[PDB]
Amino acid sequence: AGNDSNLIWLDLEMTGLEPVEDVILEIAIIITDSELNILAQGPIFAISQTDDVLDNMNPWCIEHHGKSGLTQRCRDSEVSLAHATKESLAFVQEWVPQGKSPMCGNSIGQDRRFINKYMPDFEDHFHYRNLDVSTIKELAKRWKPEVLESVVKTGAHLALDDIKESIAELKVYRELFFKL
């Protein structure tokens, strides 16, 4: 329930990877408890974007985010970045108290960068720490390389599945890589 040591998982899609001139296009939040049971599903926002930014997005993402259906959802969305922030932060505020959960996902150091610039209010609620599953992957690769084979290969259309299968991935690290 909404107390104790629950976790905020999130994933993001951007234009490219340099945040001082690149922008958030999508965000999703998933809250689990400490044992990786999904406890809640936050809002999924496609953030309004200038038609100019979206057409001259850095390519391949042009290819990928046109392919996703995501790009037009930003053309057709009136969700500012503020509103996304305001309701993202409200969402989390009812599942764990300020400053207790880390930011959990895959390669999450790079998401914070954009979170810290564009969604300052949303970041103030997270523990200063990250919990990156991709950090564990590579201890795995260097120590017990065989457990990597029980990770499921792919599939991640929406950001939710990107979150969900990074939660699944941890659970096979939990049972096959950690003492108890």
Next chain:
Amino acid sequence: AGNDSNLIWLDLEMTGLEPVEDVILEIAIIITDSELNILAQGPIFAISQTDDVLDNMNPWCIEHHGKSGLTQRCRDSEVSLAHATKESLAFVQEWVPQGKSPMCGNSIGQDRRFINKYMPDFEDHFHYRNLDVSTIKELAKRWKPEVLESVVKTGAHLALDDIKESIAELKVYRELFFKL
């Protein structure tokens, strides 16, 4: 030796934590192999700083970095940021090839932020991933909370010890938290 899957550990001290107006004051690099045996000790640089920045550093760090001896070493250093970059990057280039090792340390997402802005050439050599021991700490705290008690309490005058005791810390996660 200088091949295979060796690791670049580093730690940093800054003025404060907002990089677009805060600056690197110190850097150290330690290379280990994949089993946490220290393989090499890189240069330790105290980066030249304007007397203006250093006096109006964000306080407490004023207290701490005056206390450290670090602050005057920056006043007395002619090491630009470029030189630090140039020889940091040369150092690493002889222990692991470009794009293979992650950036390893404690709460390292926040160091990259400064690395990516101020030392771009040094970052191009790291795997895009971080390996953060502080990520493991909190899986520990949430799953087998008892193993935290074999972590050694503190002591970290220089950046080296900050690196070294984050390498020590992993080794007690290795033996008491991970299957094998």
